[PDB]
Amino acid sequence: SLPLKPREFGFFIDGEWRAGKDFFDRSSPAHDVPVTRIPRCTREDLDEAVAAARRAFENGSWAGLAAADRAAVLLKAAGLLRERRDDIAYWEVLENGKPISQAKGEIDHCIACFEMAAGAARMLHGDTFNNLGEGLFGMVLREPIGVVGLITPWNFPFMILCERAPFILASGCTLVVKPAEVTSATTLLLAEILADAGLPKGVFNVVTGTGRTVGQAMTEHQDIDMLSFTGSTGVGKSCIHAAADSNLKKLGLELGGKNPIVVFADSNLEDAADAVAFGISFNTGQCAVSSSRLIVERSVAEKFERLVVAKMEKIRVGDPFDPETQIGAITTEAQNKTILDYIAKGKAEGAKLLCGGGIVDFGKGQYIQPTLFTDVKPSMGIARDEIFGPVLASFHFDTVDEAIAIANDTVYGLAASVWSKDIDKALAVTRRVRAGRFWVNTIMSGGPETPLGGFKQSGWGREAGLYGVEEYTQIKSVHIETGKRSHWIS
Amino acid sequence: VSLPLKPREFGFFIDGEWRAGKDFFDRSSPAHDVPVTRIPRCTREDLDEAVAAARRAFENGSWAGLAAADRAAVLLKAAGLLRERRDDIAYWEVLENGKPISQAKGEIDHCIACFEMAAGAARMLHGDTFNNLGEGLFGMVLREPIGVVGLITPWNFPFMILCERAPFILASGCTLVVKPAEVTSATTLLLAEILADAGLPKGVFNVVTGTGRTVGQAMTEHQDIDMLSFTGSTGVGKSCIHAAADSNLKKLGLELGGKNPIVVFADSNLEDAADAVAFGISFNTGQCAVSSSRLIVERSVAEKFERLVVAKMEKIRVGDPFDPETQIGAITTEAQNKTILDYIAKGKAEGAKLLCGGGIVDFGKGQYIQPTLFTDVKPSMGIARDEIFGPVLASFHFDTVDEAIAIANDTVYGLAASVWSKDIDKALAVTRRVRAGRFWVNTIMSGGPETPLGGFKQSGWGREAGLYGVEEYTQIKSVHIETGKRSHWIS
Amino acid sequence: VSLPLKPREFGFFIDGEWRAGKDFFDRSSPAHDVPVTRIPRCTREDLDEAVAAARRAFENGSWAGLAAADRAAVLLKAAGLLRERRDDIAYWEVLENGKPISQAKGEIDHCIACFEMAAGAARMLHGDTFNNLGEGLFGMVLREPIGVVGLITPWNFPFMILCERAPFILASGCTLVVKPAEVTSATTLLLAEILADAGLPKGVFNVVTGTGRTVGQAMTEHQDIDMLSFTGSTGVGKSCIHAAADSNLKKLGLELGGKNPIVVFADSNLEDAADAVAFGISFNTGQCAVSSSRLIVERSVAEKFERLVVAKMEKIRVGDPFDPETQIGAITTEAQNKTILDYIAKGKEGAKLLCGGGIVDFGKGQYIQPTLFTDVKPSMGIARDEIFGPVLASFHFDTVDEAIAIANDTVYGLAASVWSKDIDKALAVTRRVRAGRFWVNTIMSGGPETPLGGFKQSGWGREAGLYGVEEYTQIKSVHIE
Amino acid sequence: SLPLKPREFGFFIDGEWRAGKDFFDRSSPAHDVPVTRIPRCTREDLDEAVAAARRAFENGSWAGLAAADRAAVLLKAAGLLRERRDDIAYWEVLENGKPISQAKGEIDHCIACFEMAAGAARMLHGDTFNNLGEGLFGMVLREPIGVVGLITPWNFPFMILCERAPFILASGCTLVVKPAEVTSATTLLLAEILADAGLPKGVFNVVTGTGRTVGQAMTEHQDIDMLSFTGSTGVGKSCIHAAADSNLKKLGLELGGKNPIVVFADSNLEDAADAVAFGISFNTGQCAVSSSRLIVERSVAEKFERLVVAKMEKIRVGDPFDPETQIGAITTEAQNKTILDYIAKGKAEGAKLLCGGGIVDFGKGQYIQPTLFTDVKPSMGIARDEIFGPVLASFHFDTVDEAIAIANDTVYGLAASVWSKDIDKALAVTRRVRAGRFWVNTIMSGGPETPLGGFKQSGWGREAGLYGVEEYTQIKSVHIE
Ligand SMILES: NC(=O)c1ccc[n+]([C@@H]2O[C@H](COP(=O)([O-])OP(=O)(O)OC[C@H]3O[C@@H](n4cnc5c(N)ncnc54)[C@H](OP(=O)(O)O)[C@@H]3O)[C@@H](O)[C@H]2O)c1
Ligand SMILES: NC(=O)c1ccc[n+]([C@@H]2O[C@H](COP(=O)([O-])OP(=O)(O)OC[C@H]3O[C@@H](n4cnc5c(N)ncnc54)[C@H](OP(=O)(O)O)[C@@H]3O)[C@@H](O)[C@H]2O)c1
Structure with a gap:
């Protein structure tokens, strides 16, 4: 039933599983038995993952695809989630301690999230304003914001991951993911699932490690365009500070509650x-x-x-x-x-x-x-x-x-x-x-x-639905003048 | 043609009431080097009062509790008053900003369009129903005014940027605490007058004039402002972001720099x-x-x-x-x-x-x-x-x-x-x-x-105008209703 | 309140011009049995003329070619004139319909809301962009006014239902040919005046008064009415449907009976x-x-x-x-x-x-x-x-x-x-x-x-809201590259 | 590779394959060899299918499911489409004559259609109007219109079917489908695919036969709430007449073009x-x-x-x-x-x-x-x-x-x-x-x-997209005080 020896995971950047050098040793919170060994990555690992995510985003390998192709991967990921439900849940339980029945039921929601995102990939749309006049055509484009950092907590490691990642990917964003150090296994399993689903290299990168090292580096990262953070209001505020101190990256904050x-x-x-x-x-x-x-x-x-x-x-x-x-x-x-x-x-x-x-x-x-x-x-x-x-x-x-x-x-x-x-x-x-x-x-x-x-200090932005996909897009209004310009200068 | 004989001394505007200032910023025409306006330098207590008024006006339903039709009525009437007062608004705009009168007047047209757009958007502001979730599960998504919105605007398009924010913020039922640029506060105070004449309930639009380093910083740090519309430099935009983190996690609509x-x-x-x-x-x-x-x-x-x-x-x-x-x-x-x-x-x-x-x-x-x-x-x-x-x-x-x-x-x-x-x-x-x-x-x-x-990247957060700009100052509330019999978790 | 000493003779309204009738329907107050209005009994030629004016006004860009801002301006000004003329519209509404004046006045408020809503919707009328189809394939969905819209309205809420259709049709840039109920045409002609005074371009709103047998049937059968808003009996709705099949396949927004x-x-x-x-x-x-x-x-x-x-x-x-x-x-x-x-x-x-x-x-x-x-x-x-x-x-x-x-x-x-x-x-x-x-x-x-x-036999399509504006638009998908 | 004897199909009512009594014999238009034998169903058969679709719609077995469940079936059908690509294309080619490469490529679009509809099943949404005041809450619900007739032509038998049926099914509508008599095979194959995908019985029924027998009864049926018709403008017009003369069923018309x-x-x-x-x-x-x-x-x-x-x-x-x-x-x-x-x-x-x-x-x-x-x-x-x-x-x-x-x-x-x-x-x-x-x-x-x-006489309504799923829903405004 339980692992005889803790499973050693690698981290995942640019489609490559990377052996760790330093490791977090995770014991089952329910069983006090070693279950996993998770790479404690560096800021340089993070940079490579962001670089891979940047490359995968800029080269069109994912955002340049038709929604159909992103939906295909997501629908395949959803299928693999079903096939691997028991394995994901087993590792989810080992690292989180939640009941196996609950973990399995969470996978169902994860599958629904992937399907929803796949559907949303196709329905992701902006506006046309064909009502602006004979020579003025207006549109609103949505486009993936780009490289999205994803930091997730340990309470619903896989589920919250699946309540973010597919919706972010759906628009064509690429991902650098830091799961909770204590519950990274199933996030790495999703990385495998996505790779098996046909997700291009660099689109989903997992940099495991601590919030202070990897997470902070993500929120401060000069080349992450947006960060989905789910966790404490305290660390959320740190994300906000880090956005202000770096590149004004957008933050989808899913914070505390009472x-x-x-x-x-x-x-x-x-x-x-x-x-x-x-x-x-x-x-x-x-x-x-x-x-x-x-x-x-x-x-x-x-x-x-x-x-x-x-x-x-x-x-x-x-x-x-x-x-x-x-x-x-x-x-x-x-x-x-x-x-x-x-x-x-x-x-x-x-x-x-x-x-x-x-x-x-x-x-x-x-x-x-x-x-x-x-x-x-x-x-x-x-x-x-x-x-x-x-x-x-x-x-x-x-x-x-x-x-x-x-x-x-x-x-x-x-x-x-x-x-x-x-x-x-x-x-x-x-x-x-x-x-x-x-x-x-x-x-x-x-x-x-x-x-x-959430409202108030429970976070910024929304996740899941079409909203959650739109949350990781930028809105680009486009006004095209088709009649001859009346010159400003005589 | 003619500049004010003596600089026009303005009040600030809290809870539907004009307030005499105590300290005043003296503004000269950047184009004429002549004193044109005298603007209250408000204090943090003024700001707190304005937030308290905006909070009151928001929580008592005097604005957010109205039908969109009533908010649209005010916005549409304001749009009419903008047209009527075009020349006066443009005059004060020019005086404090230095932009050409023809541009200033033409800017007012955009302001009118914004008020009309927001008036329309007030009615069309909508969420979603998910009637597709099963016989026993009804889902909807509500939009609701986020609440008290701080509005900080710059001096380059003082009235227009204000009008490219305030009506859209107001349209959903938000209340506003506004700090215009210290050097171009007049026309924002004119909008407060216009909004009051348009029937805007007291406390829904408050103007606390003063510096970004005093009033503005206190706005970004305010524990009771739910969202801040900030238009200005990316540098100060970052100050807003820090201030949100350091206060109440208020949402930020940032319209920042560009190149x-x-x-x-x-x-x-x-x-x-x-x-x-x-x-x-x-x-x-x-x-x-x-x-x-x-x-x-x-x-x-x-x-x-x-x-x-x-x-x-x-x-x-x-x-x-x-x-x-x-x-x-x-x-x-x-x-x-x-x-x-x-x-x-x-x-x-x-x-x-x-x-x-x-x-x-x-x-x-x-x-x-x-x-x-x-x-x-x-x-x-x-x-x-x-x-x-x-x-x-x-x-x-x-x-x-x-x-x-x-x-x-x-x-x-x-x-x-x-x-x-x-x-x-x-x-x-x-x-x-x-x-x-x-x-x-x-x-x-x-x-x-x-x-x-x-903007993308460091040019800001969120979007303004359109239906989007009205939605930006709303909160999204998912609602799931189970009908029928609950299948109990505990046996 | 004084009833009219002699029935008020109206014209019909084509291409921004009031038109003298030749034949007239004589309408007496259903509440007072005194003549109140005299309404032109128009012909297929009047109808064709209005449709041609609406066609012209639609094709020349005088309305559909404008910015939504300019259509909104007219609808908003129309809404203002509605408020100013509430008492006058309500008076003629009462005279030809018999509804209480208090109700008629409150209906005018809703009419104003409709014009404002329509004005808002004029600007918000939008389609979709599909920027998600791949770098080499861009998709859009355009909305555009369907064109010339026939509008047939009943006598129970002559002015209100008119305002629950016309501004929403107008908002997208459609032009209108309107036949109100023969017995309650006055306030529809008053709206024609209100719209003209609001700056509505000529031919965008035409009123051809008369019977459903002559004018209405000609509207539903018209080879150049692109869409018809019909509000009335399910029976006549089916006649509109038949007429659509037998003519130009005009779309039908039907608001029919109910129980x-x-x-x-x-x-x-x-x-x-x-x-x-x-x-x-x-x-x-x-x-x-x-x-x-x-x-x-x-x-x-x-x-x-x-x-x-x-x-x-x-x-x-x-x-x-x-x-x-x-x-x-x-x-x-x-x-x-x-x-x-x-x-x-x-x-x-x-x-x-x-x-x-x-x-x-x-x-x-x-x-x-x-x-x-x-x-x-x-x-x-x-x-x-x-x-x-x-x-x-x-x-x-x-x-x-x-x-x-x-x-x-x-x-x-x-x-x-x-x-x-x-x-x-x-x-x-x-x-x-x-x-x-x-x-x-x-x-x-x-x-x-x-x-x-409505559902089922209570009609087709929806009126009012942005939906109602969208109902009188055609959806045009566009794929580039 | 060509069929030794024509494949005799049944028609599909209430999840059950039904042997035909009368048969249309279809020969390959490309090879002039007998290819299929297709039930020429009756109006009683059609009534039975409508009754099953009505049953399947009212008992909540499809419309009462969560969107997730309809999406599951649609996504599974999409999966079966991929598995059965070659078989579908083979029969498609046999009855239609289109090239195998095109038929196979059309199936890719069919899969996209099922995937899209599965996605749309979840996104199908109406509006909340939380802006109407503290004491008035407004909602706009979308709900499957009910029993949908689907009549398809022979030029793209499988593709047009898949460009309608999944979008219709997505909302919770049930289907009675009459494919073109000359190209019914792959539509029956879709019924099987849908059954294997877990589609509840009666949700997708195929009544094969002629437009003048089966089709006309669908368009005239008193219990079909909406009919998707794809085919000639002439027959589209007959559907319109039939809708007016029956139950005012909504019509999604995909008609001619030039x-x-x-x-x-x-x-x-x-x-x-x-x-x-x-x-x-x-x-x-x-x-x-x-x-x-x-x-x-x-x-x-x-x-x-x-x-x-x-x-x-x-x-x-x-x-x-x-x-x-x-x-x-x-x-x-x-x-x-x-x-x-x-x-x-x-x-x-x-x-x-x-x-x-x-x-x-x-x-x-x-x-x-x-x-x-x-x-x-x-x-x-x-x-x-x-x-x-x-x-x-x-x-x-x-x-x-x-x-x-x-x-x-x-x-x-x-x-x-x-x-x-x-x-x-x-x-x-x-x-x-x-x-x-x-x-x-x-x-x-x-x-x-x-x-x-299309615009004008090229049809009514839109298909595909979330819009096409919405076309088979009814809009229900709800105001709560
Ligand atoms: N949907 C939601 O709103 C939601 C759901 C779940 C949890 N939460 C909230 O999360 C809290 C409990 O979870 P938790 O204790 O795991 O919260 P946490 O301490 O904020 O941890 C959340 C995640 O943030 C990482 N992190 C820590 N410091 C960071 C930094 N400086 N920069 C970037 N990332 C950093 C953590 O890494 P480490 O692994 O090193 O800690 C972890 O992966 C509660 O407030 C709960 O309400 C929110
Ligand atoms: N739509 C847009 O994106 C847009 C439009 C106009 C301006 N801008 C940007 O604004 C910059 C130039 O305008 P500016 O010089 O007026 O910018 P700014 O220095 O950022 O000032 C903008 C506004 O913020 C206030 N402010 C200053 N410090 C603040 C603080 N710590 N907390 C809160 N509010 C504070 C200012 O008050 P004071 O009156 O005391 O300065 C002023 O009202 C450029 O980068 C330009 O691109 C953006």
Whole structure:
């Protein structure tokens, strides 16, 4: 089942797998066994990857193709994703700790993303303005912005990769990808999948390594035209600084969240409780769209919190390779400590622990119980800070206005969920809560047809959908004068 | 004809209310060296108040909660008031900026078009429905005004750039805190008056006048401005980006510098191209971010064309901006005047050949600079790379389409580009392969607000005008609704 | 308000010129039975002349060749003149139609919105670029005005429907030949004046007044009308369709009949729904294609709700359309008045009369009481056929599926209304009822931002919104190299 | 390699192959050997297929799926198309006569069409109007129109099918397909491909038979919500009548054409000559987008015509299974006579034959030479009538205005091609010639990213592109208060 020896990966620039010299040793967060050895690349490796990406972009080998040919590769990548689902998921689990059932289901979304991007490759379009007059023809062109840096986090290593890479590639952009050091394997597998899919060399390059070395060099890179960053708001701001200090590269930022899940008394309380438990426990709460702030109508608040407790206590925690396991390991020790500290702060600051609050001790790996706090004052740390763990903070409200104000009482704005059978309540919360991803009587549903992204400090730009493909294009307005010019100078 | 007897002292505009300043910036006509205006130097507390007003006006639904029809009504009425007040706006525009009155008036037409475009866009602003997701899953994408928008504008097209931003920002339901250039604040304050007369609710458009280093920097750093429209130098654009990172991650619509190529092919109408080239670098005395500052001309006609451009530049009517025949006006600021003259000196010092201009035009008053053409420009010279923001054209020769494109693309910028060729393939190749956000084919600086404008690379972020410019100040909200019965995660 | 001492004689409008009639239709106020207007009865030669003017105005670039900015300027100025002339348009609208003056005035607001929307759409009208086809292949999709557009409008919303078509057609650069309903031509000629005063070039908007038999049929058959907007009966729509096949294959934007459901759930705000149901069937005295003709109400509240509708339907102010308090005006034509009364007679097939059932006799004009039938069986005439009067047929249901099946049980599909606070019920009904215009917990509330049109036999194409501007454009794909 | 006995097909209803009772016997138009036996279905068969498509549409088995699931099937079908390329092309060649190389290359476009439709299935979207005020939310939904009839011609049996069916299927529409009786094989093969790709039963039904039996019943059917018709303008008009006389079904019409190819002196004349020869000789001119009217600048007209003559005479005519063969057989005897007649009419009316003008005698099928007439006067039959054969009518011009006026001098408006290195000429012609599919310095080059269709009598609606998927959706405006 688990690797007898950690799998040594290379990094990938210009279609060539490159042996590492220095390596990050990744142990399974769920099993405390060595699983992979990932090259710790240098800035020079990054430069070569950017150079390869630049070459692959400037020589027309990808952007010069018909959308049909880019779609062909992406549709083939999607097919290979299906064929390799189990292998990708196995390595995804090994490095991330998420359940194998979840990882497999994520691959389905990844396949949908590739198909969507393939479709979007063809539908990527600008405008014609044939309405400007007899001698004035206007158009708006879209063209791939060029070399796109892609930095991804460890919580959904492959999925977030597939929620970016295909959409970026679809327009004809080329990619330099730095996955999270702890979860680089499946990104390298995608590099192989893409190569097997017929992606030209240099179009998808993976420079593995640390955020401080490779990532920072990417965000500062003078020849990366745009960077998709998914990760903390803190490092996102560093990306922004780096863009300003380098080449003004565009940034597609997918940052933190402290997402509200607003539950009204007139919701299906059982459904909402399941969704709330799911919303904060999915990926063991290592989820930027996790519903970490329960905002429940006071009349059902205390019952509903308990409904969530019942739901959370039935969540199957265990070996992620158990197909029955529903939430897996905390991916990193730092995040594990962060979550535990936040639970400690929650207790210390006077919040009432309703369930969870501690580790799950399997003697191996790092697991944390789904945790629900109530009696949370908006000023508590667990109320404001992204815990990135299965830690739910519950807030009560009497009115729709209070619900949306609590929901909006955040620096973030990634996601929000509203549970109500009342169309007006649903639409009011949906329309007035500043979140880029909204779920009404659902959570974390919807495929790559729709753009995703955040308001406020949750990021810049949108990903997936046609939007996500357009996000990595530049808009070029073109005005053609066809009549004789009336001269400015006599 | 007649300058103000005493400089007109303006207020600033917060929450529908004109405010007396405490400290004032004294602005003299750059064309006349006469005091013309007196502008409040606002404080950060003023800025905070304006943001608070913009926030209030945004959150209380007085603007964003209206129907688009009501926002369109105000924008359309404002468009009407722009037409009615054209001469007055243009008068103050000329006074603070130095551009010719005829250009200033014609700029107002574009302003009217922008307000109409935005008024129309207000209604057409839309997201998506995904009715194709299955019986039990309904998806939509909403657009909504991002909220409080900071708007920082430069002095070169004070009113026009303002009107190329504010109505599109407003159209979605955003509220605005505006800092115009310190030296050209009047007409932005006039727009506040116009907008109020057009029925714009209080707090929706606020003007906090003052310096970019005080009010502007505080705007870019403001914890409660959700987005900042910045038009100005790439250098200050970078300050905005840092400031966004250091504050609230506000979105930035950046309209930055340019070093825009005008690619002239031998098979173009060379006389038309020469006129457009002369215009492209001389319009607004070259204080124009979309100015065609880099002539990229096919070597076979390069010398003929450069001479054609010189002949065109020599006839550009320089003079008193209130002369309706004046075609280029004063340099707006002394710093920019010195910068332009320095770049002309640097051009000569670096070995470029001056073909015409190269110096001031001395009227004994104000600051005028001759339309200036350099040839023998090497790509590494300062005038080849730095934006001079004056009427200084650098000429480069090419033999091949690829060379023209490589020269045209040889810049950190990517705001604008012009290609002159009757050959559809050359025109399309240059158009598609030169990294500029605004392309003109056999034209220059044409096309109204129907289309988005913006830059590639260091020329900015985002697009302005068109429906795009309205969408740029909206947030995209995906909404998935599950109907039917939830399949429970937990058993 | 004074009615005209002598009927106002109009001209028809060709190539920017007012044209004296030879023969005239004499129109009396349907509300006052006094002559109000005299309208030219034009010929095929007048029609051909207008089409030739519209052709000329289209081919010479005087309108389509302009920048969208200049078309927008005219439409915006037209919108301004509409506001200035609201009272005058509304007066003639009331005189020839019988709708209340208050309603006529509010319709003018929507007309202004339409002109503004059309002005905005003129600039935003766009196709696509396909810059993604490879370095050696560039693709575009151009939109261009289809050319000369015939516009046939009905008498129920003569000015409003005109403004819900004409500016959207004009926005793209199309030229128009308009035949309004013979009985309600005045305000269409007034728009011709408004458009001329707004700077519309000559020949871009031509009004050939007259009968559908002469002018309309000639429009639908015309070898040089590139597209025809028809708003009117499904029957005449089919005649337009036949005429298109038999002539030049002109495109048809058809806005046809309807038998629209208003689905009311017990969990709706029942008082609001009752008001909306009363409004939806009584607005314009039910002479409304988007009228909620079939109340589909949850059995658990059905007769209680029917009572609320009865109570509100009996409180609707019927009277002189010039009374600003009047909420329903006259039936516009005798034929329609007979039809509605006949349908009330047929209904009385055993349907239970709950309110109305008869005319309102103020002594003059033609008024019909807001009428509610219950115990309506799906096979009855009043259940299925469009009455085009203030005649509501009530049906009961227990399940969402039933409501949707009842709602969909029509050859039509113009409009639908669902009343429920339940989001699942609202979306299920909204998504599964085949109607082009849907209202959730509202009725007749959307402005011209959105396209309007029908499913099934309620029409072809959409009007209003940018879609409606696009409907009168041709799509031209362009591939280069 | 030729079939020993004609392949007897069934027709395809509700996922089941159905043995025919009456049969159309199809012989290879290129080889005059029996090739297929195709059910001549009845109107009852068609009713059954419609019922299945109605069933498959209403039970949510296709329209109720996520777009992802329809895309999955479409993408899988695209995969099966690639696997079955040779088999599809083989039967396509047998029944149509086109060269195997072209038939195989057409399948590439078919795959692109399925891929594009799969993509569009996911992107198919309407609008949200979140800008209508705090108390009014507006939406525009798109939804599959329902049961779509699909009637296709014999000139591109598989390609046109794949240029319609997947785009129609993409939205969730179900299909009843009648291919050309003479070329039904590969359409039945698509039904199988779609079944193997997991398409639910009843979503794609093929009722083979005649247009006058099966086709007319489709166009007249009371339960077909929209019909995609590709074929003659005459029959397109019959569909229009049938729609008016039945259920007001929407019509996507892809009708005739008389397409201009405007060649300027400043074009690459050899490139244009090759494109001109191809544009009229592709599919042996049995192509609605064929450039049948050469409109060439007088200054190079005769020089260019000679280049075209030289190009046409090198066009490899022969056995379509020869991979080197460039143009194949005339597909039907009626069309062969028609082409030959028009060549006769061309000579009889005084046009100067420069090349071709007769059959190519292989002792076997029906082949016609690429044919070029010059001195063609606008009143001649070959100038105006669609020949649907490899017969080029050449016209000369001096001015851009002339080229455009000649190009527009047709009742049709399907396609046009302009050849010029001059961007102004290219854009002027492109913008002013009323054709729905335009080629600049190319011919027949766009993939399915773009909509295709005609102006004027060349059809209604657009196909391919997201637009073509949208054409088979209904627009439903929704306003929520
Ligand atoms: N869709 C979303 O919005 C989304 C989804 C997932 C995660 N997140 C957010 O990410 C956070 C948790 O993930 P995390 O702890 O992995 O975040 P993180 O510390 O920001 O790491 C994200 C990625 O950025 C890299 N990185 C680190 N420093 C960098 C620098 N200076 N320049 C460039 N790249 C740099 C990291 O490399 P290393 O491998 O060396 O750390 C990693 O690959 C939460 O705030 C969560 O909400 C966002
Ligand atoms: N559409 C365009 O892309 C466009 C158009 C015009 C100008 N530009 C660019 O602008 C440059 C020349 O114009 P300029 O001299 O006015 O540019 P600038 O120095 O960047 O000034 C632009 C505006 O930014 C303000 N500002 C200055 N420092 C700031 C700071 N730290 N934070 C926030 N705002 C600050 C200025 O205030 P002060 O009034 O105190 O200077 C002024 O209102 C050229 O590079 C040109 O290409 C761009």
